[PDB]
Design an enzyme around this catalytic site. Structure first.
Site, PDB file in Angstrom:
ATOM      1  N   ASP A 180      -0.621  -5.217   8.653  1.00  0.00           N
ATOM      2  CA  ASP A 180       0.198  -4.223   7.946  1.00  0.00           C
ATOM      3  C   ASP A 180       1.477  -4.843   7.357  1.00  0.00           C
ATOM      4  OD1 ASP A 180       1.818  -1.976   7.203  1.00  0.00           O
ATOM      5  OD2 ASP A 180       0.683  -0.730   8.612  1.00  0.00           O
ATOM      6  N   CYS A 214      -4.801   1.949   1.015  1.00  0.00           N
ATOM      7  CA  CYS A 214      -4.389   1.360   2.278  1.00  0.00           C
ATOM      8  C   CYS A 214      -3.793   2.580   2.944  1.00  0.00           C
ATOM      9  CB  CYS A 214      -3.330   0.260   2.103  1.00  0.00           C
ATOM     10  SG  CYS A 214      -2.372   0.232   0.581  1.00  0.00           S
ATOM     11  N   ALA A 216      -0.437   3.780   2.258  1.00  0.00           N
ATOM     12  CA  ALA A 216       0.316   4.425   1.174  1.00  0.00           C
ATOM     13  C   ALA A 216      -0.356   4.209  -0.188  1.00  0.00           C
ATOM     14  CB  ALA A 216       1.745   3.885   1.140  1.00  0.00           C
ATOM     15  N   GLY A 217      -1.234   3.211  -0.253  1.00  0.00           N
ATOM     16  CA  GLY A 217      -1.936   2.909  -1.489  1.00  0.00           C
ATOM     17  C   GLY A 217      -1.049   2.247  -2.530  1.00  0.00           C
ATOM     18  N   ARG A 220      -0.845  -3.239  -0.151  1.00  0.00           N
ATOM     19  CA  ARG A 220      -2.080  -3.998  -0.107  1.00  0.00           C
ATOM     20  C   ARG A 220      -2.980  -3.619  -1.279  1.00  0.00           C
ATOM     21  NH1 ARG A 220      -3.249  -3.097   6.309  1.00  0.00           N
ATOM     22  NH2 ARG A 220      -1.960  -1.246   5.834  1.00  0.00           N
ATOM     23  N   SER A 221      -3.002  -2.334  -1.625  1.00  0.00           N
ATOM     24  CA  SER A 221      -3.803  -1.863  -2.747  1.00  0.00           C
ATOM     25  C   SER A 221      -3.274  -2.508  -4.031  1.00  0.00           C
ATOM     26  CB  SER A 221      -3.716  -0.336  -2.866  1.00  0.00           C
ATOM     27  OG  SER A 221      -4.229   0.310  -1.708  1.00  0.00           O
ATOM     28  N   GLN A 261       4.656  -4.339  -2.050  1.00  0.00           N
ATOM     29  CA  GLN A 261       5.754  -3.888  -1.200  1.00  0.00           C
ATOM     30  C   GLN A 261       6.757  -4.908  -0.679  1.00  0.00           C
ATOM     31  OE1 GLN A 261       7.044  -0.790   0.125  1.00  0.00           O
ATOM     32  NE2 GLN A 261       6.227  -0.479  -1.952  1.00  0.00           N
TER      33      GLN A 261
HETATM   34  C1  LIG Z   1       9.757  -2.022  -2.053  1.00  0.00           C
HETATM   35  O1  LIG Z   1       9.860  -0.725  -2.673  1.00  0.00           O
HETATM   36  C2  LIG Z   1       9.346  -0.569  -3.901  1.00  0.00           C
HETATM   37  O2  LIG Z   1       8.803  -1.467  -4.504  1.00  0.00           O
HETATM   38  C3  LIG Z   1       9.474   0.785  -4.505  1.00  0.00           C
HETATM   39  C4  LIG Z   1      10.131   0.912  -5.775  1.00  0.00           C
HETATM   40  O3  LIG Z   1      10.644  -0.178  -6.454  1.00  0.00           O
HETATM   41  C5  LIG Z   1      10.275   2.179  -6.389  1.00  0.00           C
HETATM   42  C6  LIG Z   1       9.777   3.345  -5.766  1.00  0.00           C
HETATM   43  C7  LIG Z   1       9.127   3.247  -4.515  1.00  0.00           C
HETATM   44  C8  LIG Z   1       8.963   1.973  -3.858  1.00  0.00           C
HETATM   45  O4  LIG Z   1       8.314   1.851  -2.607  1.00  0.00           O
HETATM   46  C9  LIG Z   1       8.615   2.836  -1.626  1.00  0.00           C
HETATM   47  C10 LIG Z   1       8.128   2.348  -0.262  1.00  0.00           C
HETATM   48  C11 LIG Z   1       9.300   2.102   0.712  1.00  0.00           C
HETATM   49  C12 LIG Z   1       8.861   1.624   2.101  1.00  0.00           C
HETATM   50  N1  LIG Z   1       8.631   2.789   2.950  1.00  0.00           N
HETATM   51  C13 LIG Z   1       7.818   2.733   4.034  1.00  0.00           C
HETATM   52  O5  LIG Z   1       7.774   1.812   4.841  1.00  0.00           O
HETATM   53  C14 LIG Z   1       6.919   3.989   4.167  1.00  0.00           C
HETATM   54  C15 LIG Z   1       5.832   4.023   3.034  1.00  0.00           C
HETATM   55  C16 LIG Z   1       4.891   2.826   3.065  1.00  0.00           C
HETATM   56  C17 LIG Z   1       5.027   1.765   2.124  1.00  0.00           C
HETATM   57  C18 LIG Z   1       4.165   0.653   2.161  1.00  0.00           C
HETATM   58  C19 LIG Z   1       3.140   0.577   3.154  1.00  0.00           C
HETATM   59  O6  LIG Z   1       2.251  -0.493   3.272  1.00  0.00           O
HETATM   60  C20 LIG Z   1       1.746  -1.012   2.061  1.00  0.00           C
HETATM   61  C21 LIG Z   1       0.955  -2.249   2.392  1.00  0.00           C
HETATM   62  O7  LIG Z   1       1.431  -3.309   2.642  1.00  0.00           O
HETATM   63  O8  LIG Z   1      -0.365  -1.997   2.374  1.00  0.00           O
HETATM   64  C22 LIG Z   1       2.998   1.635   4.088  1.00  0.00           C
HETATM   65  O9  LIG Z   1       2.008   1.571   5.053  1.00  0.00           O
HETATM   66  C23 LIG Z   1       3.869   2.746   4.045  1.00  0.00           C
HETATM   67  N2  LIG Z   1       7.788   5.175   4.086  1.00  0.00           N
HETATM   68  C24 LIG Z   1       8.346   5.739   5.179  1.00  0.00           C
HETATM   69  C25 LIG Z   1       9.806   6.143   4.954  1.00  0.00           C
HETATM   70  O10 LIG Z   1       7.784   5.927   6.256  1.00  0.00           O
END
Ligand SMILES: COC(=O)c1c(O)cccc1OCCCCNC(=O)[C@H](Cc1ccc(OCC(=O)O)c(O)c1)NC(C)=O
EC number: 3.1.3.48
Length: 282
Positions: A180, A214, A216-217, A220-221, A261
């Site tokens: 993850d 994944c 959040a999609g 990884r997606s 991410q």
């Molecule tokens: C880094 O943020 C961004 O790039 C971004 C942006 O620029 C603009 C708008 C939204 C953005 O991204 C917004 C995501 C911020 C990160 N938030 C979290 O940890 C989670 C959601 C999340 C995100 C990635 C995950 O794995 C993915 C994986 O690796 O498979 C996941 O399991 C769950 N939210 C909460 C509060 O529980």
């Protein structure tokens, strides 16, 4: 090629900077439908929503919402639907989308439970004798076969529209070894997984868009689709070094937020592409 840039960024250890550099330039559109109170229980993460212009609409007069985005890459001639891992009450919506969009494959890049927590519902039957029926969208799902490999599993499923008794074969590609928020030690297994998906025909034009997810999609997606599109481009163009991964990512972010991410996933995407290139050229 892009490898040249790779060393440059690596030797100067500036990934974190280059990644944030993309977050600042990334697109930002409204997600009003996703934010309606009526759809609160249809979203897994309040911070992960589909833009309105590119959201997938369910074909029902009730509520047409589902946290899923259609990413359409013009030049690459490929499209992907990135969605969140189905929730306890959206499994019916999820399969409705697959049916309505004429998808042939579903790519899951996460395990039902990660870091000791539930990241997705068990939206597909685990045993042949135990088919699932989604009453709300009138669909029947049945496990046909399964092939369990070292780092991934491929399931052949049968989706039937109980309304018209029409049936289709859906291929389920389950990458089960992706930590993850992290990235594999070697892209090789990842790439090997990608090609398995490609070889099944699920990414082809004669079929609806492949469904990728994944938890959040987006992370990884995002990595999966970014690598696939980049390789496809070098494959089509008269100049395999003209492919700008950062340009491809941004182009994708116009359709769904947060693709990729962490700066690490970005680095991994570069690796996956560079390595996959070695095959694309004989
Ligand atoms: C880094 O943020 C961004 O790039 C971004 C942006 O620029 C603009 C708008 C939204 C953005 O991204 C917004 C995501 C911020 C990160 N938030 C979290 O940890 C989670 C959601 C999340 C995100 C990635 C995950 O794995 C993915 C994986 O690796 O498979 C996941 O399991 C769950 N939210 C909460 C509060 O529980």
């Amino acid at each position: 090629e892009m490898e040249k840039e790779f060393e440059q960024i690596d030797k100067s250890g500036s990934w974190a900077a280059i990644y944030q550099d993309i977050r600042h330039e990334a697109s930002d559109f409204p997600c009003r439908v996703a934010k309606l109170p009526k759809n609160k229980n249809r979203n897994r993460y309040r911070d992960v929503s589909p833009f309105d212009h590119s959201r997938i609409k369910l074909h029902q007069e009730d509520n047409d919402y589902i946290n899923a985005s259609l990413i359409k890459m013009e030049e690459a001639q490929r499209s992907y639907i990135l969605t969140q891992g189905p929730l306890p009450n959206t499994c019916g919506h999820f399969w409705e989308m697959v049916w309505e969009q004429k998808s042939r494959g579903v790519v899951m890049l996460n395990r039902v439970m990660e870091k000791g927590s539930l990241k997705c519902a068990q939206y597909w039957p685990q045993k042949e004798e135990k088919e699932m029926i989604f009453e709300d969208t009138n669909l029947k799902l049945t496990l046909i076969s399964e092939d369990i490999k070292s780092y991934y599993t491929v399931r052949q499923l049968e989706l039937e529209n109980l309304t018209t008794q029409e049936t289709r074969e859906i291929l389920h590609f389950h990458y089960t070894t992706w930590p993850d928020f992290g990235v594999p030690e070697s892209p090789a297994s990842f790439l090997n997984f990608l090609f398995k998906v490609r070889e099944s025909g699920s990414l082809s034009p004669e079929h609806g868009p492949v469904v990728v997810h994944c938890s959040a999609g987006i992370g990884r997606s995002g990595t999966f689709c970014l690598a696939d599109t980049c390789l496809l481009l070098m494959d089509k163009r008269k100049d395999p070094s003209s492919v700008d991964i950062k340009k491809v990512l941004l182009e994708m972010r116009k359709f769904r937020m947060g693709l990729i991410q962490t700066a690490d996933q970005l680095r991994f995407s570069y690796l996956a592409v560079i390595e996959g290139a070695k095959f694309i050229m004989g």
